[PDB]
Every structure is written in structure tokens, then in C-alpha cells.
Amino acid sequence: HQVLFQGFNWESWKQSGGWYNMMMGKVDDIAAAGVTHVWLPPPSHSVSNEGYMPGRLYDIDASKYGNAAELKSLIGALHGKGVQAIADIVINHRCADYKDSRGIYCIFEGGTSDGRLDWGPHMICRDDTKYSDGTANLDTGADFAAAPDIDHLNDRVQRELKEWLLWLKSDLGFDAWRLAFARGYSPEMAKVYIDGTSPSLAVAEVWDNMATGGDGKPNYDQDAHRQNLVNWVDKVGGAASAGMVFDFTTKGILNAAVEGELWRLIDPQGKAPGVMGWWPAKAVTFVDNHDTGSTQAMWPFPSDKVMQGYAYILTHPGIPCIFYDHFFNWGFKDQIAALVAIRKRNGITATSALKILMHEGDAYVAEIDGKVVVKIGSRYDVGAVIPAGFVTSAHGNDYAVWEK
């Protein structure tokens, strides 16, 4: 059994009294709902309020979300209830506290009295000429325009970041990682940090654009998109590696599918169309995160159909990740909990088997491990598709789950 929970949204830093402090009162509900891991925001000093422009990595007290004591307290609370903590690791780029003699912000400060992470432009990818001094290696991946991109091929860089990551585990209690903007460096580099820090899991955010048509809708065939994702996992170490990826393929298809196009939910081989259908053990599914949803809303799930999104990922192969707002703010708390309960009770895991029973525009029906049947869609009556022995146990707007 494994169910993730993103424990913050894009407005969290703003929480009166501190975000971690407020999360303490949510721990028991999260644990009781069957969550096994909670993904927490980037914990260090950041030039940006949300934490995605990290500077003094060791300076946890400067975080807008709360300080080290407050963070350790939350992680300890989660651990007391048997839930693990995943930290949002932002290492593609970094902001330097000080300017060099060129007036460029490229002299770093790790946040400790000694020289840990006190880098210079020599650690900035040479091709990021907005900040580099031309001496470093070429960036192993994509660039982040608003800040210096780090040269992960630099030995001191690899050594000091691994040192830092191990301190997050030993000093704050983090168990695992969420690799922010993993397209920014190669899978080979991600392997260095993953293999060198032994996380219970390392879920990478590898976000590639999805193929779409002239009408704006994603193509039915998204094999190229999930292929990129499995190729990343292969390169990071495959089955032996703790690394895995967010299933953006499933997110994109699902966004469009629920709009009366549920025939999109099966590929020509009879399998789920996203990463879930090719390497479920490595696919972390989700309805929305702080980027696609929340106040950023870069690619929100159709608002009136969110529970169909959860009826899908919570009963299916892959590792589902519940979004904070959906659980505590949309009034779906009991319904989501019931779905997680059905998943756990029937022993459904990331590798459970999926047998699709119906895949028409307004009706998708699937059977998992021969023990659960789920339906989503605007077509009310699918009773002729339900196998004998199955009784309904959860249901709401345009979705229903049976157990037999």
C-alpha cells in the first residue's frame, strides 16, 4: 500500500502563523485517510516566497513556510502516525547571495559558518552566460532562465549537495525526495544524487509538452510522451533505482478524457494510455498539483469533474498522489478517504492488474485485480457491464465503485 499526498498549494507560504504549524492539526486526518507519504515544499531560504529559487540551502529558518524546529515537529508528527516525509528538492538552479567584482550575483552562501556550498561562478554551467565565468562544464539539461543553473558534473557540487541531502534526512527527518524540474539536468546526474542518498523514493518532475491537434486537444496517441518518461526511469537505473516519475501523460489524457471523451482511456493494446500502462510501479498519478491547479492553474482538471479524477487514480495501478486542496478544501474529504479505504482493503498496489470493461465517450468501466470495479462518466446506467458478485460501495457525481 502506497498513497502520496501533496501537503501544500501555491498560497501556503502565506499561512497566518506558519504553514507547518497549521499542518500539525491536519496530520491525524491525513494518516487516518490512508496516506503513506506527504510531499512538503522546498524547505530552505529562497529568493522567491514559494521556495523555488533556493539560495542558502542550509538556512531552513529563513523559510516562509516555517523554521527548522517547526519543520522537525511536523515530520516527527507524521512519523508518529507512520507517514513518511518527502522533501521538494530544487537543485537545477540556485541563487547566489552576493555579487562578484563583475556585479553579477554568482558568489554563493550555503548558510553555515564554514564553506559548505559557498560556491562561485565556477559552479555555474558555462553556457548560462547570464551568470557564468565560462570555466564550468556544459549544463547536462535544460536551463532555468531566472537564476544560475548549477554544474552537476562539478565534483565539489556533487559532493556538497549529497552531503546536504543526507543532512535533510539526518537532521530534519526527511525520508524521500521530489526532484523539481528534473528536465534541468540529465537522468545520469539524478542517479548520482538518488544512489548517493538512499531515499525511500525519488519522484521526478519531468515535464515535457504534450502533442496536441489543431483543436487544442491532446492527440489520442501519446506513446511518445510516456516513452520519454520510461526512458528517463531506464536511464536513472530502472527497477533497482528508487527513482520514479509523475505521470504527466495520464494527467494530460485524463484532463481531456472526462469531457465526454472517455474512449481516450485505453490504448490500442488494451492498456492504460499513460505511464501507468507501461511501468505502473514507476508512475505517480495525480489530478492536479500546485502548478496545474491552485492559484497558478496552468492546466487545471475540469473543476466539476474532480471526483472522477480521484475515482480513477485511487482505484488504479500506479502510485496515486492526492492534492491538498481537493482533500481539505473542496468538500471531498470523506469521499477521497472512502476511495483510499477501498484501495487499501482490497490490497491494490502500484502493480495491480487492470482489465478495462468499457471505454465509450461517456462511460469508462474497469476492473482491478478482479476485486474492484470502477466507473466514471455521465452515462448513468452501466449495470449490464458489472460482473456478477459485485456490490456498489462508493459513489458520487458521475462515478461509482463496486467490491465483490
Ligand X SMILES: C=C1O[C@H](O[C@H]2[C@H](O)[C@@H](O)[C@@H](O[C@H]3[C@H](O)[C@@H](O)[C@H](O)O[C@@H]3CO)O[C@@H]2CO)[C@H](O)[C@@H](O)[C@@H]1N[C@H]1C=C(C=O)C(=O)[C@H](O)[C@H]1O
Ligand Y SMILES: C=C1O[C@H](O[C@H]2[C@H](O)[C@@H](O)[C@H](O[C@H]3[C@H](O)[C@@H](O)[C@H](O)O[C@@H]3CO)O[C@@H]2CO)[C@H](O)[C@@H](O)[C@@H]1N[C@H]1C=C(C=O)C(=O)[C@H](O)[C@H]1O
Q: Which residues bind ligand Y (CB under 6 A)?
A: 227, 230, 234, 238-239, 269, 271, 278-279, 281
Size of the chain, expressed as the number of residues it contains: 404
With contacts defined by CB under 6 A, how many residues of the chain interact with ligand X?
A: 27
Question: How many other CB atoms are found less than 10 A from the CB of residue 179?
Answer: 27
Q: Residue 396 Cβ, how far from ligand X at the closest point, in Å?
A: 5
Q: Interface with ligand X includes 382 (CB under 6 A)?
A: yes
Q: How far is CA 159 from the centre of its chain?
A: 25
* Residue 116 grid cell: 559548505
Strands 4-6 and 37-40: parallel
Q: Residue 318 Cβ, how far from ligand X at the closest point, in Å?
A: 20
Q: Interface with Ca ion includes 288 (CB under 5 A)?
A: no
Contact residue for ligand X among 1, 380, 387, 389 (CB under 6 A) = 380
Q: Residue 281 Cβ, how far from ligand Y at the closest point, in Å?
A: 6
Q: Interface with ligand X includes 291 (CB under 6 A)?
A: yes
Question: Which one of ligand Y, Ca ion, ligand X, none is in contact with 247 (Cβ closer than 5 to 8 A by kind)?
Answer: none
In whole angstroms, give the CA distance from residue 274 to residue 358.
17
The CA-atom distances, in angstroms, between 138 and each of 122, 124, 133, 142 are 11, 9, 12, 11
The CA-atom distances, in angstroms, between 176 and each of 17, 57, 356 are 26, 17, 33
Binding range to Ca ion, per CB under 5 A, among 21-29, 111-119, 278-286, 388-396: 111-119
Are 76 and 135 in contact, with CB atoms under 8 Å apart?
A: no
Nearer to ligand X, 4 or 31 (CB): 4
Q: Interface with ligand X includes 392 (CB under 6 A)?
A: yes
Helix, strand, or coil (residue 256): helix
Question: Which one of ligand X, ligand Y, Ca ion, none is in contact with 13 (Cβ closer than 5 to 8 A by kind)?
Answer: none
Residue nearest to ligand X (CB): 383
Here's the x/- map for Ca ion, 86-105, by CB under 5 A: it reads as: ------x-------------
Here's the x/- map for ligand X, 205-244, by CB under 6 A: it reads as: x---------------------------------------
Beta bridge partners of 40: 87
Are 215 and 239 in contact, with CB atoms under 8 Å apart?
A: no
Q: Interface with ligand X includes 147 (CB under 6 A)?
A: yes
Q: Interface with ligand X includes 386 (CB under 6 A)?
A: yes
Question: Which one of ligand X, ligand Y, Ca ion, none is in contact with 143 (Cβ closer than 5 to 8 A by kind)?
Answer: Ca ion
Question: Which one of Ca ion, ligand Y, ligand X, none is in contact with 188 (Cβ closer than 5 to 8 A by kind)?
Answer: none
Q: Interface with ligand X includes 396 (CB under 6 A)?
A: yes
Question: Which one of Ca ion, ligand X, ligand Y, none is in contact with 118 (Cβ closer than 5 to 8 A by kind)?
Answer: Ca ion
Binding range to ligand X, per CB under 6 A, among 15-23, 218-226, 288-296, 343-351: 288-296
Q: Interface with ligand X includes 267 (CB under 6 A)?
A: no
Nearer to ligand X, 169 or 290 (CB): 290
The DSSP line for 79-122 is HHTT-EEEEEE--SB---SEE-TTS-EEE---SSSS-TT---GG
Nearer to ligand X, 32 or 298 (CB): 298
Closest CA to 342 of 380, 381, 276, 399: 399
In whole angstroms, give the CA distance from residue 399 to residue 208.
30
In whole angstroms, give the CA distance from residue 382 to residue 363.
8
The CA-atom distances, in angstroms, between 376 and each of 133, 180, 181, 192, 404 are 56, 32, 32, 42, 18
Binding site for ligand X (CB under 6 A): 47-48, 50, 52-53, 144, 146-147, 180-181, 205, 290-291, 296, 375, 380-383, 386, 392, 395-400
